């Protein structure tokens, strides 16, 4: 998967497993969610193509959001979208199956650097908008979780099991976006 | 309510009703949620005291989080907690009942400035920790929504109505925390 560099990033993340422990606590994330995040990957794995179409149908339906994938002329860079889409598919499975250890944290830093001006448009060698305004990364927590929800039901899991999978996804997504704020936040304020 | 200065803030917010429109869209917030956020205020209004005890029982159960309310000696400033608790009660009702207009946005800027080093500890004239690390404001989206959820059921509303109220709260909370990132984010990166 071109540009997917999990386990081979150049930089150590500025946060460690102790930062991670304390952040999982703020998001109420426990061993029970690790079980259910894993079970969510099992339900979503088959359905990944449809999820990405839904996710991109949301993004592309709003000009101010599709904007972050556009060429300087205001039109979508179809090469950009396609390369990023493959890495997004990976992130679904990584969120479900990786031990959230130092390598995981090193890749979280990297993904944050990629939405931010520090490394946006480098991974795919594209000319696009310089920075994704952070206000939108926070905002996106909600539609990421809403998009996942009907897919988690699709395999006829009970609504309780479904609820627990969704809550795990909500926590794990909130957790990640919080780490990704690092290159956006004033030094010392994170 | 001492220090509650909604409608009398010194500064115009650096974001306007156009920024707000575009952000509500990213969080999927529509006129349907405005109806249900309002109906949520009706269900939660009676229960505010219990909600604040639950919310503070979460915060106080984790040293690294209670930390942000402590005096320099590491012990909780009970005067701080009590003053802030009254303003938090207001925010429950404001989120449910205010038109999200320029005054609302001006107060969002203010609340963000208050968690951030810019104005933390000024409103109550207390000596406490200088800044609340932003990583935790994002993280808190989740426990704010989880704390609200069982209270929204308490009045024997159907689980559908309850679901719609919760989803409105999740969206409105995500929306607010995104605005509050402003004084934390590098200029031009928001
Ligand atoms: C909940 C918040 C978000 C999640 C979970 C998410 C997920 C992801 C993932 C997994 C990647 C690929 C990472 C990799 O390189 O391995 C990516 C990249 C990207 N995303 Fe997001 N994202 C979020 C916020 C946003 C927002 C608000 C936008 C604005 C439309 C956006 C647009 C983009 C763009 C343009 C890239 C490519 C960045 C580059 O040029 O390297 N994302 N996202
Ligand atoms: C979803 C995220 C959060 C929400 C919805 C929220 C809500 C609020 C509200 C409504 C106020 C009073 C605002 C006013 O002055 O009118 C407040 C203040 C305060 N909160 Fe939060 N908050 C969040 C994140 C956090 C975090 C992560 C902490 C860390 C423990 C925290 C601790 C505090 C402190 C210390 C104050 C007083 C700040 C000052 O000295 O002015 N909050 N919060
Ligand atoms: C990112 N989507
Ligand atoms: C703030 N609690």
Residue numbers in the entry:
A (entry chain C), B (entry chain C): 6 to 195
Reported in the publication:
The Phe(93)E11Leu mutation does not prevent the insertion of the Trp(60)B9 side chain into the distal site and the stabilization of the haem-Fe(III)-bound cyanide. Thus, the ligand sensing capability of the E11 residue, reflected by Trp(60)B9 conformational changes, does not require specifically a Phe residue. In the Phe(93)E11Leu mutant structure (three MaPgb* chains in the asymmetric unit), however, the haem-Fe(III)-bound cyanide molecule is stabilized only by the H-bond provided by the Nε2 atom of Trp(60)B9 (∼2.8 Å). Indeed, the orientation of the Tyr(61)B10 side chain matches that found in the MaPgb(III)-cyanide structure, but its side chain is slightly shifted away from the center of the haem distal cavity, its OH group being at ∼4 Å from the cyanide N atom. Analysis of the crystal structure shows that the mutated Leu(93)E11 side chain imposes to the Tyr(61)B10 side chain a slightly unfavorable location for H-bonding to the haem-bound cyanide (the OH group of residue Tyr(61)B10 falls at 4.25 Å on average from the haem-bound cyanide, in the three independent subunits). However, no intervening steric impediments are present for the formation of such H-bond. Indeed, inspection of difference Fourier maps reveals the presence of a positive electron density peak (∼3.8 σ) between the Tyr(61)B10 side chain and the haem-bound cyanide in one of three Phe(93)E11Leu mutant molecules present in the crystal asymmetric unit. Such observation suggests that even in the static crystal environment a fraction of the mutant molecules may stabilize the haem-bound cyanide through two H-bonds. The only exception is the Phe(93)E11Leu mutant, where two H-bonding interactions are expected from the dissociation kinetics measurements, while only one, to the Nε2 atom of Trp(60)B9, is found in the crystal structure of the cyanide derivative.
